[PDB]
């Protein structure tokens, strides 16, 4: 009939000690833009006691805040003021250890995490067999070509597809360093059937046949 509720968990947070700085304002105090809360009729912040609890401290900000709020007045040299708030309990709040530089693995998750296998994306996996898409039919007897057309990935997918009667593959691995992210211009290794698909490049399998009937209205 009666159970046992789980233990209490301190609300996770990432605070930072107080370090007087001369950041352009003598003994000024800087902090990220997400560490300010209005109390009563004035801005303020939250200071954490050494005995795992939170309290509110009214401040008086005067210096501008360009993504970094800079205040002057009402400070405790070497005090862990919060820099992540907006949902804490005003009267009192049992805080979670914020001592680690990034108590969250987000500091390295942007580059790599290490849990399981990676996701999918067009250009690395084999698409399923589908009816032949009406080719881009952008071929013209030839030069420059919009960077969107070519979808060279690590040099292993040069747009080798020929724009001819079969939409086959060819030995066109010319790579010019004039890569201005706007258009690719080449002097050698070009032909009439050198052009390729615009968007359906990586999402297409080599040698796949196409259809001449195109959608238009």
């Amino acid at each position: 009939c009666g159970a046992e509720p789980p233990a209490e968990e301190h609300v996770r947070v990432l605070a930072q000690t107080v370090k007087m700085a001369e950041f352009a304002a003598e003994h000024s105090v800087v902090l990220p833009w997400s560490a300010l809360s209005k109390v009563g009729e004035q801005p303020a912040v939250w200071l954490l006691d050494q005995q795992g609890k939170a309290r509110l401290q009214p401040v008086r900000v005067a210096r501008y805040a360009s993504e970094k709020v800079v205040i002057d007045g009402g400070l405790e040299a070497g005090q862990t003021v919060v820099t992540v708030g907006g949902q804490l309990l005003h009267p009192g709040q049992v805080v979670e250890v914020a001592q680690p530089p990034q108590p969250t693995q987000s500091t390295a998750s942007r580059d790599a995490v290490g849990g399981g296998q990676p996701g999918n994306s067009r250009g690395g996996d084999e698409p399923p067999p589908a009816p032949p898409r009406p080719v881009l039919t952008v071929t013209v007897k030839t030069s420059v070509l919009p960077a969107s057309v070519l979808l060279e990935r690590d040099g292993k997918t040069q747009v080798w597809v020929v724009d001819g009667k079969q939409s086959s593959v060819a030995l066109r691995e010319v790579q010019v360093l004039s890569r201005d992210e706007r258009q690719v211009v080449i002097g050698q290794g070009l032909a009439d059937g050198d052009r390729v698909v615009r968007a359906g490049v990586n999402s297409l399998k080599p040698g796949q046949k196409i259809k001449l009937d195109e959608d238009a209205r």
Binding site: G40, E41, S66, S109, N120
Partner: protein, 389 residues
């Protein structure tokens, strides 16, 4: 003893939906550029992109579409709301995917409100537990909401509580004396013109490039707009060709102003929603916490008021006419019985069996710990009918 033990029997108005679909919502601490929302979105996406039961998953930055009339939808809270829909193979809790996601967000960045959600069957009810606090003054209702959540967090069976629009925004106040303007050769007209050319330039005619229409907008040079830091000590140009630093300005400073409010019934208010823990039902928790919070509410000026925001309101509203309708039908069926019989003695005799049937309905319910279901609140009447039969 049956009627006695009836007290601790828990009640719930609606169960969830076994649909293999699941959703998750996120809310940022303060309003920022939608770019930040997309940043958190893509990070969470990169986290979950290869695992079993993970397929047919989409994002929603600023608004969540509607599948069925089951849930509601936060219309436009881009800077404070996001959505992620995921489809499981057989069960969202098969491998406790929801729990894994909870641990993921836990290890994720702090100060990011997040909540998991399995689709619910029945009329929308929003968060399972909420509370509304009123006040004709901003700071008053704010501090009172804080003083309320303080006492509310007494019981540890609640995961976390979240206030509403309880954060200000960095506002920039500026003004001119207009004396130096005419002194330097500047009029209020050109003043407003410049001020417009700095924030949002004038509007011009639209264009018809296709079936759609594109409205072109004018604006001054951007080498003087884009960031506040560069907007310091600006040598603003004058229509007379001259250029003078912003020194002629005054009171240019930072202030705080919450850009979100809720004038429920033409009155400001705050909505505090709280998650749960363990396995109790919101109704029972509300009943338990009712006295203390009531006293707290009493300890406040009369012009203010507190109300619940959970599901008890909806349950009561639904069962409203029930009480005012069922007794009439009771007497109807009673007379119906009296038609076949001819003595009140036999009437009361067979009637005695009617209430006594509440034995099994609870005996087969207490050990299982199953909450009192609304459907049962209905079927019990059918039970009365059949037993009387």
């Amino acid at each position: 003893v049956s009627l006695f033990l009836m007290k601790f029997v828990q009640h719930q108005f609606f169960p969830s939906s076994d649909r293999p679909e699941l959703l998750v919502d996120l809310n940022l601490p303060q309003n920022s550029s939608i770019h930040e929302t997309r940043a958190v979105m893509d990070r969470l996406e990169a986290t979950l992109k290869d695992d079993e039961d993970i397929d047919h998953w989409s994002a929603y930055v600023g608004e969540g579409a509607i599948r069925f009339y089951l849930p509601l939808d936060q219309q436009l809270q881009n800077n404070f709301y996001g959505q992620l829909v995921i489809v499981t193979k057989d069960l969202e809790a098969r491998e406790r995917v929801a729990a894994r996601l909870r641990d993921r967000l836990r290890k994720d960045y702090v100060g990011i409100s997040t909540y998991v959600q399995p689709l619910e069957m029945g009329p929308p009810v929003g968060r399972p537990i909420q509370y509304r606090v009123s006040g004709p003054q901003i700071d008053k209702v704010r501090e009172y909401a804080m003083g309320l959540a303080g006492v509310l967090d007494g019981n540890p069976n609640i995961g976390d509580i979240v206030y509403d629009w309880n954060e200000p925004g960095k506002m920039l106040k500026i003004d001119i004396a207009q004396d130096k303007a005419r002194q330097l050769g500047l009029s209020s007209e050109d003043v407003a013109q410049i001020m417009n050319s700095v924030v949002t330039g004038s509007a011009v005619t639209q264009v018809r490039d296709d079936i759609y229409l594109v409205n072109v907008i004018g604006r001054a040079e951007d080498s003087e707009r884009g960031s506040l830091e560069t907007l310091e000590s600006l040598q603003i140009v004058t229509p007379s060709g001259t250029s003078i630093p912003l020194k002629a300005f005054a009171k240019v400073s930072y202030e705080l102003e919450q850009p979100l409010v809720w004038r429920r019934d033409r009155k400001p208010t705050i909505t505090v929603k709280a998650s749960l823990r363990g396995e109790i039902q919101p109704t029972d928790l509300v009943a338990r916490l009712a006295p203390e919070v009531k006293r707290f509410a009493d300890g406040l000026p009369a012009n203010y008021r507190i109300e619940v925001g959970g599901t008890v309101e909806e349950s009561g509203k639904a069962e409203g006419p029930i009480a005012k309708v069922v007794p009439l039908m009771l007497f109807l069926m009673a007379t119906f019985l009296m038609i076949q019989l001819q003595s009140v003695q036999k009437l009361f005799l067979v009637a005695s069996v009617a209430p006594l049937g509440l034995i099994g309905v609870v005996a087969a319910l207490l050990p299982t710990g199953t909450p009192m279901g609304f459907v049962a609140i209905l079927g019990i009447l059918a039970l009365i009918g059949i037993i009387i039969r």
